[PDB]
C-alpha cells in the first residue's frame, strides 16, 4: 500500500482512478498496461491500476492476455469511471483487499477458463455449473489461447455475493476437468 | 469480370486472400473494413472480403460491430489463412472460390432477455442437448450500457433441420438471433 503504479501519463483517467483508491499513497505512472503490471511483479509498487473494460470498445485485450498468460496477481478492487467512451471498468491489482469507502455497487469474481481438449463445445458444462446454483454470469469474453485457431481461454465474471456457493461451483469445475485461473475476487465501486 | 471489394492497400494480406480465392475477378481495395462492406451495400461490388478473426487480437471488433449494428447482410463463405487468420466473404450467394472446401457452418448473433448475459447457458444448452457443436463464442458490447452485450456463436451446420429446431427452441426461450452467415469454410 505505499507505492502505486497506474497507466500514465499524469492526469489520465487511470490516474484519476488510482487517486481515489489510494489517496494517501505515492502514485507512479508507467507507459503501458504491461509495464504497469510488471512494476508490481518487480516489487517497485504495491498495487497496480489498469483499465480492463469499456462500455463501447469492450475488454482491453492487453490487460487480460497479460493477466492470464504471465501474471500471478489478482484483481482486488474494481472502480467504474464515467467518461465524457461512457463507462470504463478499472481494476486494482495486488495481493490484498484494500479498504475503499466509495459507493459499493456489486461483488464479483472473474475467472479465466480453459476447456478439456480446448474445445469450446464444453462451455455449456462450465456455465451450467454456475447456472444451476443460480450464480449469475455477468460477462463472458474469449481470447486466443495463442496455440492454434479455434483454441481459446474464456474470461467470465460471476456475481460473488455467495462466496461459499461459488466455492462449490469451482470444485465442480475441477471435478468435470475444467481448469480455471481466478483473476480476482473484488468489490465494485462506481 | 466480377468486382470484389477487399481490405486495402494493394499487397495487403486480405488482397492476397482475395487474390487466391478469386483469380478471375476485379479486386477493388478500400481503406478500412467499414468501407469494404459499404462498397457491397452500395452495389459497387458483388462481394466483399473482410477479416473476422486474428491469431493475436482475436475477433475483429469493427467487422462484427458493423455487421450486427448496421448491416443486413450475410457471410456466404469463410476462408482460413484488421486481422490475420479468418476471413468472411460477404454477398448474396456463395461464389466460386478456388480453394479447398472444408466445412459447413453458421454464425449467429444472439441477444438475451433483458440483455443480461446470465441466460447464455440456455442458448448453449439448446445446441448441446442436440449434439450441435459450438466452435466459437464471443461477445461484443451492445453499445447501450455497461454490462449489456450481444453474443456471437459459430456452429457446425452438418444437420440443417436439427439447426432449425434449435432456432425454434431459442425463440421459445425468448432468445433472439441475427444470422451473420450460412457458409462453407475454405482452406488456403
**H or E stretch at A92:** strand A87-94
Contacts of B128 in chain A (CB under 8 A): 121, 124
Please report where in the chains the cell 458490447 appears, as a residue: B141
Q: How far apart, in whole angstroms, are the C-alpha atoms of residue B186 and residue B102?
A: 5
Can you read off the three cell numbers belonging to residue A118? 480446448
Question: Closest by alpha carbon to A59, among A182, A143, A138, A123?
Answer: A143
Please state the domain extents for chain B. 1-97, 98-188
Q: How far apart, in whole angstroms, are the C-alpha atoms of residue B157 and residue B135?
A: 11
Count CB-CB contacts under 10 A for residue B178: 16
Nearest CA-CA distance, residue B77 and chain A, Å: 17
Q: How far apart, in whole angstroms, are the C-alpha atoms of residue B44 and residue B67?
A: 18
Q: How far apart, in whole angstroms, are the C-alpha atoms of residue A95 and residue B150?
A: 33
A113 close to A156: Cβ distance less than 8 angstroms: yes
Q: Which residue(s) pair with B7 in the sheet? A: B30
CB contact under 8 A, B147 and A124: no
Q: How far apart, in whole angstroms, are the C-alpha atoms of residue B60 and residue A59?
A: 13
Residues with Cβ within 8 Å of A41's Cβ and at least 6 positions away in sequence, in order, are A71, A73
Per residue, the 3-state secondary structure of B134-188, as one string, reads EEEEEEEECCCCCCCEEEEEEEECCCHHHHHHHHHHHHHHCCEEEEEEEEEEEEC
Q: Which residue of chain A has the CA closest to B129?
A: A124
Nearest to B146 among A87, A140, A146 (CB): A87
Nearest CA-CA distance, residue A91 and chain B, Å: 15
DSSP letters of B2-52? -EEEEESSTTSHHHHHHHHH-TTSEEEEESSHHHHHHHHHTTS-SEEEEEE
**H or E stretch at A104:** strand A104-114
CB contact under 8 A, B85 and A138: no
Q: How far apart, in whole angstroms, are the C-alpha atoms of residue A144 and residue A99?
A: 35
CB contact under 8 A, B55 and A144: yes
Quick one: DSSP state of residue A155? E
Distance of CA B22 to the CA centre of its chain: 19
The torsion angles phi and psi of A99, rounded to 5 degrees, stand at -80, 120
Q: What is the CATH code for B98-188?
A: 3.30.70.260
Contacts of A128 in chain B (CB under 8 A): 121, 125
> Does 3.40.50.300 match the CATH number of domain B1-97?
no
- A170-173: list long-range contacts, CB under 8 Å, 24+ apart: A172/A129, A173/A113, A173/A126, A173/A129
> Which experimental approach was used here?
X-ray
Can you read off the three cell numbers belonging to residue A3? 507505492
Q: Which residues of A155-190 are buried (b: 16+ CB within 10 A; e: fewer)?
A: bbbbbbeeeeebeebbebbeeeebebbebbbbbbbe
CB contact under 8 A, B139 and A137: no
Strands A74-82 and A137-144, by their bridges, are: unpaired
Q: How far apart, in whole angstroms, are the C-alpha atoms of residue A21 and residue A75?
A: 13
Can you read off the three cell numbers belonging to residue A121? 463445445
**Sign of the alpha-carbon dihedral angle for A106, A138, B146, A145:** positive
Residues with Cβ within 8 Å of A136's Cβ and at least 6 positions away in sequence, in order, are A130, A158, A159, B116, B118
Cα angle, residue B155 at apex, residues B154 and B159 outer, rounded to 5°: 150
B99 close to B188: Cβ distance less than 8 angstroms: yes
Nearest CA-CA distance, residue A68 and chain B, Å: 14
Q: How far apart, in whole angstroms, are the C-alpha atoms of residue A36 and residue B54?
A: 25
Contacts of B147 in chain A (CB under 8 A): 138-139
Contacts of B61 in chain A (CB under 8 A): 57-58
CB contact under 8 A, B143 and A55: yes
> B114: burial class by Cβ within 10 Å (0-12, 13-18, 19+)?
exposed
Q: Which CATH number fits domain A101-190: 3.60.21.10, 3.30.70.260, 3.40.50.300, 3.30.565.10?
A: 3.30.70.260
Quick one: DSSP state of residue B94? P
**Measured in Å, how far apart are chain A's first and last C-alpha atoms?**
21
Interface test with B, best of A124, A132, A145, A188 (most B CBs within 10 A): A124
The torsion angles phi and psi of A35, rounded to 5 degrees, stand at -70, -35
Contacts of A123 in chain B (CB under 8 A): 124, 134, 137
Nearest to B140 among A58, A124, A144 (CB): A58
**Measured in Å, how far apart are chain B's first and last C-alpha atoms?**
22
Please report where in the chains the cell 516489487 appears, as a residue: A43
> A11: burial class by Cβ within 10 Å (0-12, 13-18, 19+)?
exposed
Per residue, the 3-state secondary structure of A20-79, as one string, reads HHCCCCEEEEECCHHHHHHHHHCCCCCEEEEEEEECCCEECHHHHHHHHHCCCCEEEEEE
Can you read off the three cell numbers belonging to residue B57? 487480437
Q: How far apart, in whole angstroms, are the C-alpha atoms of residue B67 and residue B152?
A: 11
Interface test with B, best of A111, A115, A144 (most B CBs within 10 A): A144
Can you read off the three cell numbers belonging to residue A78? 474494481
In Å, how far are A37, A79, A92, B29, B110 from A31, measured between CA atoms?
11, 20, 17, 35, 37
Residues with Cβ within 8 Å of B11's Cβ and at least 6 positions away in sequence, in order, are none
Residues with Cβ within 8 Å of A122's Cβ and at least 6 positions away in sequence, in order, are A115, A116, A178
**Three-class SS state of B125:** helix
Q: How far apart, in whole angstroms, are the C-alpha atoms of residue A110 and residue B64?
A: 25
CB contact under 8 A, A142 and B58: yes
Nearest to B121 among A128, A139, A152 (CB): A128
Q: Which residue(s) pair with A59 in the sheet? A: A53
Amino acid at each position: 500500500t505505499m507505492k502505486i503504479a497506474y497507466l500514465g501519463p499524469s492526469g489520465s483517467f487511470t490516474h484519476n482512478v488510482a487517486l481515489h483508491a489510494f489517496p494517501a499513497a505515492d502514485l507512479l505512472p508507467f507507459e503501458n498496461i504491461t509495464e504497469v503490471i510488471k512494476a508490481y511483479e518487480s516489487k517497485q509498487v504495491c498495487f497496480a491500476i489498469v483499465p480492463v473494460e469499456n462500455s463501447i470498445e469492450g475488454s482491453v485485450h492487453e490487460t487480460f492476455d497479460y493477466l492470464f498468460h504471465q501474471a500471478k496477481i489478482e484483481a482486488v478492487a474494481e472502480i467504474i469511471l464515467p467518461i465524457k467512451e461512457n463507462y470504463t471498468r478499472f481494476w486494482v491489482l495486488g495481493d490484498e483487499t484494500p479498504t475503499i469507502h466509495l459507493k459499493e455497487e456489486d461483488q464479483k469474481i472473474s475467472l479465466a477458463l480453459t476447456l478439456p481438449d480446448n474445445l469450446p463445445g464444453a462451455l455449456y458444462k462450465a456455465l451450467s455449473t454456475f447456472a444451476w446454483r443460480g450464480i449469475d454470469l455477468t460477462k463472458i469474453e474469449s481470447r486466443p489461447l495463442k496455440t492454434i485457431l479455434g483454441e481459446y481461454f474464456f474470461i467470465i465474471d460471476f456475481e460473488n455475493h455467495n462466496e461459499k456457493l461459488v466455492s462449490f461451483a469451482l470444485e465442480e469445475l475441477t471435478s468435470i476437468g475444467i481448469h480455471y485461473k481466478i483473476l480476482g475476487k473484488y468489490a465494485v465501486y462506481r
